[PDB]
């Protein structure tokens, strides 16, 4: 049979070889990386079929490889829990990663170190597979930090560009703040329950208290903010686009950001018993959705706009997950649809950039629809999916998420539904902006660029991504197949029929149409200006990424530097100061005493006659001291 | 039963004597003989570890002889899990340090041409004294070698090393020797107290006998006297293992000494301070250690955060690594004194992992510094383009010190943090902040030195940064392999460590708190 751990062991070994083989395998290393990603996809499909071939509890696969950290009461055993929730992420990761690897074959063809890039991709895939497969939170953390490392490495590619290195550092630092939150979560979990495994934790989940469970949930939410790039840990997405486009595709569509949603859903048993943590998750999801949409509206670079769109979509994920079992399944379904159409969009943008001589500013774009037909078609398919038009994949998933949010009930329900609807409308607006500025209007090209159609190796992955962004929605949404499949692992909330589904379906479509009309008037009816237009304070704020990076710079970079200078001063003047003062005191006393050595025999005789001190001391010892 | 521990600690010393006695013209042969001696010590350590049975008695390979009955001290050797871990660390590292410092002493003139021989002999003597201290089961013998191993390292710093080698060596030796003399005060106090107690035939230094007497309660002592003895031992070990704020000697010594000697200091030698804490401070003064646990826990956590912050603030690569090592020692002490199975096992595993990781990182940084002529962080840039292997190994070592789960140190740091929370939640969180701080001071340094445009004179000029030579690869690859192995599969180490730690806890009347649920 095929052991589940091969899924983790498959890419990692590849990466290992590609990292150790070096230039020896530079000529063909990418071939090995792509082959190994495809092998991982094949193994994932086989395991998914096997799970389908099982029924009930037999569907999930639990495999403990070895005892890992047998320290006292910890007794953590390295194990994998490939269940109905895990298999969905396995399929998403493996498939989208294989498609992105194939796309990178051509995207990185004209760039050296392609073998090293594919080594990093394999390490990334292995790390995320470990993240989603680990049956205990310690293995989850292992995959988590491995994914952080892989994201740093890939973003850090083209290290000669300082912007890429800075973006990689920022990404790792923010994700490490998230990992710190997750570490506190695990640490509280062990302190209270005494176990780290999913099974033991969830069995003991009913115990503890609302306060403790809420603390665990909030720390896990902080971790998700780290990986999922939700506020306040969202600023790292923008700069991360400095890396190669396939890196952005893998990070955003699946994997990296998907990690936070996976963590929230997997911990769902904890959140169900911690309503305050669920409220925090909901608040974070809504706020980050709105912020990402607002930022995307202003971003001029295609990469930045797509990053903002991903942030908003992951905000949708977080909102749905915070809704509880009423939204967990919807969160996962919309996550799969997002993987598909966002990967398609990122690959299309990468093809455009390659054709546009690496240009990223959408002002230079325009009229690309005709000159780049296949990439335009795939990008438009993903665009319809993310927009949420009925036929497209994202339609059903986003509609279900919005329905759950508005069905949360009361003030919570109305506010969440309104936030989701506004986010959908703004998504329509800024995606329409991107599309119009890119593929329509005058050429606006510069430097006599000569756009060429993407190669077959890059094109085929784009076509498959578009096919997914068209199909996956109906495939999972229609019939509640995803809901029934996740019911075993994810608690089934059933439904409450808060509002007639048709009213929400119509409201979402109306908001999307309003946004589309506004964008067409602004950029289609009106010619796209080639320069940044002045606008309301909100316009510049969004152009400055909602002044979120500035907040980090002023609070943490500046405050951190102040603290570092203070500590350096303490070390140099206070800590070392005590030893310096002691040494100076000893030296001064030594000089003073040496001054007593006057060199005159008579002075020494006087000191000796100071033996009267000895005499009086001996006598007084009898006089009671 | 062959006296395995006696051979273990004697072989480095005898080899040092032979190497220094070699003729000046035998520099290459001297290097090879020193490497052979280190490898022989490693083989002795390997046979000891293989024969070691973690399920057997607490102390194994025990050798006992009368050395100075007048002082109530005996030549008593014996290795437990804690001691065995550090013994393995030292034995594996020292050969790697020797092949790392292969050419470090070549530039030194004078000394009758024995510069290479002197360097190798000093390194071997440091190894021998460290091993002897680790295996010693007598308080006075342990102190003898603990204080003795300063002077060879003092010479190894002042001799060889940078321009400020004199000042750095003086500060090293004086801090550590002030601590050692403060220990001596407490050691004599312990002898006096034991002599004044009927639990022993006379003043005694046998560690096992005294530990048994204190645990059984027969050797009751006034809590004030035990507190003072514990304070003396703790001060000595805190200067030895750079517990904040007694750390200030380490940065200068580490930067001024040669990279191999600096690693021998921090990676191996300084671990003796934490080992002495874990063994003596806890098993001889369980009550005093328990009473002072809050204070030293706070000191260790402050050391962690403070060292991380300073490392962020350092403009010198080697000084940055030194402060990183200070913070990691803060972790080690925090894990030791939380008196939890998870905490203490994690602290021992962290001794091992930090030794290896700091060795790798500091040696790679030393290679890079040798390529150029300045240790300034800003002096470099884009080194990845010119030396892909050097930058890659530097990244891996930093990630190890950054405590990635794929590398050994995390398993240890995690284990410590876990153990910290079960007793001191706030301190655990305060320490966990060092997880972010490590990412900062590692990745920012990597960005500054390895990335961006190739700075002038890096890829060209009279002193280009050539990639790692084969010997440096021999030094690095084993360390990275050990990091990966102990990160993926730490169990072989823990199986050794966990029993001993349990015994220690069993001896000090401590047990990991039960979960609230
Ligand atoms: C609970 C604990 C939470 C605490 C987390 C805080 C982490 C530390 C933040 C600062 C940092 O993480 O490190 C920045 C500097 C060196 O910064 P840099 O110089 O490397 O980059 C500059 C850039 O200069 C390079 O980048 C450009 C582009 O390539 C090149 O053109 C240049 O030539 C050169 O290469 C450029 O010139 C400069 O103007 C910029 O300010 C660049 O920094 C910038 O920082 C800003 C903020 O920082 C961050 O992390 C953001 C995330 C912070 C995490 C917390 C977020 C909220 C969490 C709430 C729960 C961002 O907008 C970008 O991060 C951008 O990068 O370190 C230091 O002093 C550290 C001093 C002490 C730190 C210890 C903190 C306790």
mmCIF file of C-alpha atoms in Angstrom, chain A residues 333-617:
data_model
loop_
_atom_site.group_PDB
_atom_site.id
_atom_site.type_symbol
_atom_site.label_atom_id
_atom_site.label_comp_id
_atom_site.label_asym_id
_atom_site.label_seq_id
_atom_site.Cartn_x
_atom_site.Cartn_y
_atom_site.Cartn_z
ATOM 1 C CA UNK A 333 -15.222 25.298 -0.160
ATOM 2 C CA UNK A 334 -14.521 28.960 -0.861
ATOM 3 C CA UNK A 335 -10.885 28.289 0.014
ATOM 4 C CA UNK A 336 -10.678 25.595 -2.661
ATOM 5 C CA UNK A 337 -12.382 27.825 -5.223
ATOM 6 C CA UNK A 338 -10.015 30.627 -4.227
ATOM 7 C CA UNK A 339 -7.025 28.374 -4.677
ATOM 8 C CA UNK A 340 -8.197 27.611 -8.184
ATOM 9 C CA UNK A 341 -9.127 31.053 -9.468
ATOM 10 C CA UNK A 342 -6.456 32.994 -7.561
ATOM 11 C CA UNK A 343 -3.753 30.656 -8.862
ATOM 12 C CA UNK A 344 -5.130 31.201 -12.348
ATOM 13 C CA UNK A 345 -5.111 34.966 -11.853
ATOM 14 C CA UNK A 346 -1.548 35.006 -10.528
ATOM 15 C CA UNK A 347 -0.267 32.852 -13.380
ATOM 16 C CA UNK A 348 -2.001 35.128 -15.878
ATOM 17 C CA UNK A 349 -0.432 38.166 -14.238
ATOM 18 C CA UNK A 350 2.973 36.493 -14.372
ATOM 19 C CA UNK A 351 2.516 35.762 -18.061
ATOM 20 C CA UNK A 352 1.547 39.401 -18.621
ATOM 21 C CA UNK A 353 4.618 40.606 -16.731
ATOM 22 C CA UNK A 354 6.894 38.310 -18.730
ATOM 23 C CA UNK A 355 5.307 39.560 -21.953
ATOM 24 C CA UNK A 356 5.455 43.166 -20.681
ATOM 25 C CA UNK A 357 9.226 42.991 -20.086
ATOM 26 C CA UNK A 358 8.693 42.382 -16.355
ATOM 27 C CA UNK A 359 6.527 45.508 -16.093
ATOM 28 C CA UNK A 360 4.158 45.429 -13.122
ATOM 29 C CA UNK A 361 2.513 48.877 -13.226
ATOM 30 C CA UNK A 362 -0.985 48.522 -14.658
ATOM 31 C CA UNK A 363 -0.751 52.019 -16.154
ATOM 32 C CA UNK A 364 1.623 50.689 -18.810
ATOM 33 C CA UNK A 365 -0.831 47.861 -19.516
ATOM 34 C CA UNK A 366 -3.868 48.158 -21.757
ATOM 35 C CA UNK A 367 -5.470 46.384 -24.682
ATOM 36 C CA UNK A 368 -3.640 43.195 -23.754
ATOM 37 C CA UNK A 369 -6.808 41.173 -24.401
ATOM 38 C CA UNK A 370 -6.210 40.707 -28.127
ATOM 39 C CA UNK A 371 -2.419 40.391 -28.122
ATOM 40 C CA UNK A 372 -2.496 37.815 -25.278
ATOM 41 C CA UNK A 373 -5.652 35.802 -25.997
ATOM 42 C CA UNK A 374 -5.119 32.580 -24.039
ATOM 43 C CA UNK A 375 -3.724 34.254 -20.927
ATOM 44 C CA UNK A 376 -6.501 36.836 -21.162
ATOM 45 C CA UNK A 377 -9.076 34.042 -21.361
ATOM 46 C CA UNK A 378 -7.698 32.231 -18.316
ATOM 47 C CA UNK A 379 -7.386 35.472 -16.353
ATOM 48 C CA UNK A 380 -10.950 36.376 -17.303
ATOM 49 C CA UNK A 381 -12.202 32.981 -16.166
ATOM 50 C CA UNK A 382 -10.527 33.434 -12.789
ATOM 51 C CA UNK A 383 -11.810 37.015 -12.751
ATOM 52 C CA UNK A 384 -15.387 35.836 -13.213
ATOM 53 C CA UNK A 385 -14.821 33.224 -10.504
ATOM 54 C CA UNK A 386 -13.571 35.735 -7.929
ATOM 55 C CA UNK A 387 -16.264 38.207 -9.004
ATOM 56 C CA UNK A 388 -18.828 35.497 -8.298
ATOM 57 C CA UNK A 389 -20.930 35.369 -11.469
ATOM 58 C CA UNK A 390 -23.463 32.508 -11.263
ATOM 59 C CA UNK A 391 -21.700 30.085 -13.633
ATOM 60 C CA UNK A 392 -18.255 30.703 -12.133
ATOM 61 C CA UNK A 393 -16.887 28.683 -9.232
ATOM 62 C CA UNK A 394 -16.573 31.434 -6.637
ATOM 63 C CA UNK A 395 -20.234 32.411 -6.963
ATOM 64 C CA UNK A 396 -21.737 29.580 -4.930
ATOM 65 C CA UNK A 397 -18.980 29.590 -2.310
ATOM 66 C CA UNK A 398 -19.067 33.343 -1.678
ATOM 67 C CA UNK A 399 -22.866 33.257 -1.636
ATOM 68 C CA UNK A 400 -22.833 30.513 0.988
ATOM 69 C CA UNK A 401 -20.307 32.391 3.112
ATOM 70 C CA UNK A 402 -22.378 35.579 2.925
ATOM 71 C CA UNK A 403 -25.524 33.618 3.769
ATOM 72 C CA UNK A 404 -23.858 32.164 6.858
ATOM 73 C CA UNK A 405 -22.533 35.575 7.905
ATOM 74 C CA UNK A 406 -25.963 37.188 7.656
ATOM 75 C CA UNK A 407 -27.494 34.132 9.335
ATOM 76 C CA UNK A 408 -25.264 34.627 12.364
ATOM 77 C CA UNK A 409 -28.283 36.578 13.611
ATOM 78 C CA UNK A 410 -29.109 39.833 15.352
ATOM 79 C CA UNK A 411 -26.668 42.717 15.325
ATOM 80 C CA UNK A 412 -23.840 40.256 14.687
ATOM 81 C CA UNK A 413 -25.654 38.799 11.694
ATOM 82 C CA UNK A 414 -26.604 42.113 10.133
ATOM 83 C CA UNK A 415 -23.154 43.656 10.626
ATOM 84 C CA UNK A 416 -21.325 40.605 9.281
ATOM 85 C CA UNK A 417 -23.638 40.338 6.280
ATOM 86 C CA UNK A 418 -23.273 44.027 5.513
ATOM 87 C CA UNK A 419 -19.500 43.788 5.768
ATOM 88 C CA UNK A 420 -19.468 40.772 3.451
ATOM 89 C CA UNK A 421 -21.742 42.483 0.920
ATOM 90 C CA UNK A 422 -19.649 45.655 0.948
ATOM 91 C CA UNK A 423 -16.536 43.534 0.514
ATOM 92 C CA UNK A 424 -18.073 41.741 -2.459
ATOM 93 C CA UNK A 425 -19.007 45.053 -4.058
ATOM 94 C CA UNK A 426 -15.551 46.532 -3.524
ATOM 95 C CA UNK A 427 -14.070 43.298 -4.868
ATOM 96 C CA UNK A 428 -16.110 43.757 -8.024
ATOM 97 C CA UNK A 429 -14.944 47.365 -8.212
ATOM 98 C CA UNK A 430 -11.207 46.793 -7.898
ATOM 99 C CA UNK A 431 -11.090 43.584 -9.937
ATOM 100 C CA UNK A 432 -12.941 45.436 -12.691
ATOM 101 C CA UNK A 433 -10.356 48.197 -12.294
ATOM 102 C CA UNK A 434 -7.510 45.719 -12.747
ATOM 103 C CA UNK A 435 -9.129 44.007 -15.735
ATOM 104 C CA UNK A 436 -9.976 47.261 -17.511
ATOM 105 C CA UNK A 437 -6.544 48.778 -16.910
ATOM 106 C CA UNK A 438 -4.847 45.577 -18.064
ATOM 107 C CA UNK A 439 -6.624 44.167 -21.105
ATOM 108 C CA UNK A 440 -8.813 47.026 -22.392
ATOM 109 C CA UNK A 441 -8.372 50.623 -23.449
ATOM 110 C CA UNK A 442 -5.396 51.987 -25.336
ATOM 111 C CA UNK A 443 -2.156 50.017 -25.299
ATOM 112 C CA UNK A 444 -0.322 52.509 -23.041
ATOM 113 C CA UNK A 445 2.798 50.361 -23.449
ATOM 114 C CA UNK A 446 6.268 51.842 -23.037
ATOM 115 C CA UNK A 447 9.804 51.127 -24.236
ATOM 116 C CA UNK A 448 8.465 49.485 -27.409
ATOM 117 C CA UNK A 449 7.542 46.280 -25.616
ATOM 118 C CA UNK A 450 6.678 43.289 -27.813
ATOM 119 C CA UNK A 451 4.188 41.104 -25.914
ATOM 120 C CA UNK A 452 4.197 37.456 -26.992
ATOM 121 C CA UNK A 453 1.786 34.653 -26.158
ATOM 122 C CA UNK A 454 2.738 32.567 -23.153
ATOM 123 C CA UNK A 455 4.472 29.252 -23.946
ATOM 124 C CA UNK A 456 2.608 25.963 -23.896
ATOM 125 C CA UNK A 457 4.315 24.866 -20.682
ATOM 126 C CA UNK A 458 3.014 27.974 -18.907
ATOM 127 C CA UNK A 459 -0.258 28.098 -20.849
ATOM 128 C CA UNK A 460 -1.549 24.616 -20.015
ATOM 129 C CA UNK A 461 -1.411 25.222 -16.231
ATOM 130 C CA UNK A 462 -3.284 28.485 -16.793
ATOM 131 C CA UNK A 463 -5.971 26.689 -18.804
ATOM 132 C CA UNK A 464 -6.342 24.000 -16.136
ATOM 133 C CA UNK A 465 -6.534 26.656 -13.420
ATOM 134 C CA UNK A 466 -9.308 28.384 -15.368
ATOM 135 C CA UNK A 467 -11.127 25.063 -15.780
ATOM 136 C CA UNK A 468 -10.945 24.625 -12.021
ATOM 137 C CA UNK A 469 -12.076 28.194 -11.370
ATOM 138 C CA UNK A 470 -15.088 27.397 -13.557
ATOM 139 C CA UNK A 471 -15.968 23.948 -12.237
ATOM 140 C CA UNK A 472 -14.939 23.638 -8.586
ATOM 141 C CA UNK A 473 -17.739 25.847 -7.283
ATOM 142 C CA UNK A 474 -20.590 23.835 -8.734
ATOM 143 C CA UNK A 475 -18.646 20.620 -8.166
ATOM 144 C CA UNK A 476 -18.514 21.196 -4.411
ATOM 145 C CA UNK A 477 -21.308 23.702 -3.750
ATOM 146 C CA UNK A 478 -24.147 22.124 -5.741
ATOM 147 C CA UNK A 479 -25.514 19.143 -3.830
ATOM 148 C CA UNK A 480 -23.645 20.044 -0.647
ATOM 149 C CA UNK A 481 -21.008 17.448 -1.477
ATOM 150 C CA UNK A 482 -18.340 19.403 0.393
ATOM 151 C CA UNK A 483 -20.713 19.952 3.318
ATOM 152 C CA UNK A 484 -21.500 16.244 3.619
ATOM 153 C CA UNK A 485 -17.832 15.320 3.176
ATOM 154 C CA UNK A 486 -16.735 17.706 5.954
ATOM 155 C CA UNK A 487 -19.666 16.854 8.251
ATOM 156 C CA UNK A 488 -17.757 13.916 9.800
ATOM 157 C CA UNK A 489 -14.676 15.939 10.763
ATOM 158 C CA UNK A 490 -16.264 19.392 10.753
ATOM 159 C CA UNK A 491 -19.324 19.799 12.929
ATOM 160 C CA UNK A 492 -22.484 20.064 10.846
ATOM 161 C CA UNK A 493 -24.589 23.092 11.769
ATOM 162 C CA UNK A 494 -27.287 22.149 9.243
ATOM 163 C CA UNK A 495 -29.045 25.398 8.315
ATOM 164 C CA UNK A 496 -31.332 28.058 9.754
ATOM 165 C CA UNK A 497 -32.728 29.640 6.556
ATOM 166 C CA UNK A 498 -32.088 33.085 8.007
ATOM 167 C CA UNK A 499 -33.197 34.709 4.737
ATOM 168 C CA UNK A 500 -34.542 33.385 1.428
ATOM 169 C CA UNK A 501 -31.320 32.323 -0.311
ATOM 170 C CA UNK A 502 -32.526 34.034 -3.479
ATOM 171 C CA UNK A 503 -32.568 37.468 -1.817
ATOM 172 C CA UNK A 504 -28.903 37.142 -0.862
ATOM 173 C CA UNK A 505 -27.991 35.720 -4.268
ATOM 174 C CA UNK A 506 -29.656 38.753 -5.866
ATOM 175 C CA UNK A 507 -28.139 41.271 -3.432
ATOM 176 C CA UNK A 508 -24.633 39.973 -4.116
ATOM 177 C CA UNK A 509 -25.194 40.123 -7.872
ATOM 178 C CA UNK A 510 -26.577 43.661 -7.585
ATOM 179 C CA UNK A 511 -23.574 44.842 -5.571
ATOM 180 C CA UNK A 512 -21.231 43.212 -8.086
ATOM 181 C CA UNK A 513 -23.055 44.894 -10.966
ATOM 182 C CA UNK A 514 -22.890 48.278 -9.229
ATOM 183 C CA UNK A 515 -19.154 47.887 -8.737
ATOM 184 C CA UNK A 516 -18.693 46.795 -12.347
ATOM 185 C CA UNK A 517 -20.627 49.806 -13.619
ATOM 186 C CA UNK A 518 -18.635 52.183 -11.415
ATOM 187 C CA UNK A 519 -15.346 50.713 -12.622
ATOM 188 C CA UNK A 520 -16.432 50.813 -16.269
ATOM 189 C CA UNK A 521 -17.408 54.469 -15.921
ATOM 190 C CA UNK A 522 -14.129 55.295 -14.180
ATOM 191 C CA UNK A 523 -11.739 53.340 -16.426
ATOM 192 C CA UNK A 524 -13.681 51.982 -19.421
ATOM 193 C CA UNK A 525 -15.988 54.843 -20.369
ATOM 194 C CA UNK A 526 -13.298 57.273 -19.219
ATOM 195 C CA UNK A 527 -9.809 56.779 -20.612
ATOM 196 C CA UNK A 528 -7.302 55.370 -18.121
ATOM 197 C CA UNK A 529 -4.832 58.113 -17.087
ATOM 198 C CA UNK A 530 -1.159 57.184 -17.322
ATOM 199 C CA UNK A 531 -0.249 58.954 -14.055
ATOM 200 C CA UNK A 532 -1.365 58.549 -10.452
ATOM 201 C CA UNK A 533 -4.406 60.819 -9.958
ATOM 202 C CA UNK A 534 -4.800 62.878 -6.821
ATOM 203 C CA UNK A 535 -7.783 61.890 -4.730
ATOM 204 C CA UNK A 536 -9.469 61.946 -1.358
ATOM 205 C CA UNK A 537 -7.395 61.240 1.734
ATOM 206 C CA UNK A 538 -8.727 57.682 1.548
ATOM 207 C CA UNK A 539 -7.254 57.346 -1.947
ATOM 208 C CA UNK A 540 -3.727 58.224 -0.813
ATOM 209 C CA UNK A 541 -4.178 56.150 2.343
ATOM 210 C CA UNK A 542 -5.004 53.074 0.275
ATOM 211 C CA UNK A 543 -2.148 53.946 -2.080
ATOM 212 C CA UNK A 544 0.015 53.922 1.061
ATOM 213 C CA UNK A 545 -1.461 50.510 1.958
ATOM 214 C CA UNK A 546 -3.929 52.044 4.411
ATOM 215 C CA UNK A 547 -0.852 53.460 6.136
ATOM 216 C CA UNK A 548 -0.484 50.052 7.758
ATOM 217 C CA UNK A 549 3.200 49.612 7.025
ATOM 218 C CA UNK A 550 3.732 53.113 8.412
ATOM 219 C CA UNK A 551 2.045 52.013 11.639
ATOM 220 C CA UNK A 552 4.485 49.118 11.983
ATOM 221 C CA UNK A 553 7.408 51.411 11.175
ATOM 222 C CA UNK A 554 6.374 54.007 13.763
ATOM 223 C CA UNK A 555 5.410 51.593 16.550
ATOM 224 C CA UNK A 556 7.691 48.571 16.199
ATOM 225 C CA UNK A 557 10.606 49.564 13.957
ATOM 226 C CA UNK A 558 10.967 52.941 15.664
ATOM 227 C CA UNK A 559 10.009 51.685 19.120
ATOM 228 C CA UNK A 560 12.137 48.603 18.604
ATOM 229 C CA UNK A 561 15.141 50.693 17.593
ATOM 230 C CA UNK A 562 14.641 52.932 20.623
ATOM 231 C CA UNK A 563 14.529 49.896 22.906
ATOM 232 C CA UNK A 564 17.614 48.424 21.234
ATOM 233 C CA UNK A 565 19.557 51.654 21.699
ATOM 234 C CA UNK A 566 18.465 51.823 25.335
ATOM 235 C CA UNK A 567 19.591 48.248 25.969
ATOM 236 C CA UNK A 568 22.917 48.839 24.215
ATOM 237 C CA UNK A 569 23.456 51.897 26.404
ATOM 238 C CA UNK A 570 22.601 49.838 29.488
ATOM 239 C CA UNK A 571 25.106 47.163 28.470
ATOM 240 C CA UNK A 572 27.914 49.596 27.682
ATOM 241 C CA UNK A 573 27.371 52.009 30.580
ATOM 242 C CA UNK A 574 25.454 50.166 33.319
ATOM 243 C CA UNK A 575 26.313 46.456 33.227
ATOM 244 C CA UNK A 576 29.892 46.909 32.055
ATOM 245 C CA UNK A 577 29.806 50.041 34.192
ATOM 246 C CA UNK A 578 29.696 48.119 37.462
ATOM 247 C CA UNK A 579 32.792 46.101 36.568
ATOM 248 C CA UNK A 580 34.544 49.220 35.305
ATOM 249 C CA UNK A 581 33.739 51.030 38.531
ATOM 250 C CA UNK A 582 34.974 48.129 40.639
ATOM 251 C CA UNK A 583 38.222 48.025 38.670
ATOM 252 C CA UNK A 584 38.628 51.795 38.955
ATOM 253 C CA UNK A 585 38.012 51.623 42.701
ATOM 254 C CA UNK A 586 40.617 48.888 43.069
ATOM 255 C CA UNK A 587 43.117 50.897 41.019
ATOM 256 C CA UNK A 588 42.494 54.082 43.010
ATOM 257 C CA UNK A 589 42.871 52.188 46.280
ATOM 258 C CA UNK A 590 46.052 50.565 44.971
ATOM 259 C CA UNK A 591 47.513 53.957 44.103
ATOM 260 C CA UNK A 592 46.540 55.349 47.507
ATOM 261 C CA UNK A 593 48.094 52.404 49.347
ATOM 262 C CA UNK A 594 51.241 52.555 47.224
ATOM 263 C CA UNK A 595 51.524 56.199 48.243
ATOM 264 C CA UNK A 596 51.959 54.846 51.787
ATOM 265 C CA UNK A 597 55.195 53.161 50.647
ATOM 266 C CA UNK A 598 56.995 56.476 50.998
ATOM 267 C CA UNK A 599 60.412 54.807 50.897
ATOM 268 C CA UNK A 600 61.571 56.386 54.159
ATOM 269 C CA UNK A 601 62.721 53.859 56.741
ATOM 270 C CA UNK A 602 61.358 56.141 59.456
ATOM 271 C CA UNK A 603 57.857 56.090 57.974
ATOM 272 C CA UNK A 604 57.969 52.289 57.945
ATOM 273 C CA UNK A 605 59.140 52.374 61.555
ATOM 274 C CA UNK A 606 56.162 54.587 62.371
ATOM 275 C CA UNK A 607 53.836 52.085 60.719
ATOM 276 C CA UNK A 608 55.428 49.276 62.728
ATOM 277 C CA UNK A 609 55.040 51.261 65.952
ATOM 278 C CA UNK A 610 51.432 51.270 64.835
ATOM 279 C CA UNK A 611 51.752 47.895 66.552
ATOM 280 C CA UNK A 612 50.270 49.878 69.403
ATOM 281 C CA UNK A 613 47.121 49.002 67.472
ATOM 282 C CA UNK A 614 47.914 45.322 68.035
ATOM 283 C CA UNK A 615 48.586 45.959 71.716
ATOM 284 C CA UNK A 616 45.343 47.862 72.264
ATOM 285 C CA UNK A 617 43.386 45.274 70.286
#
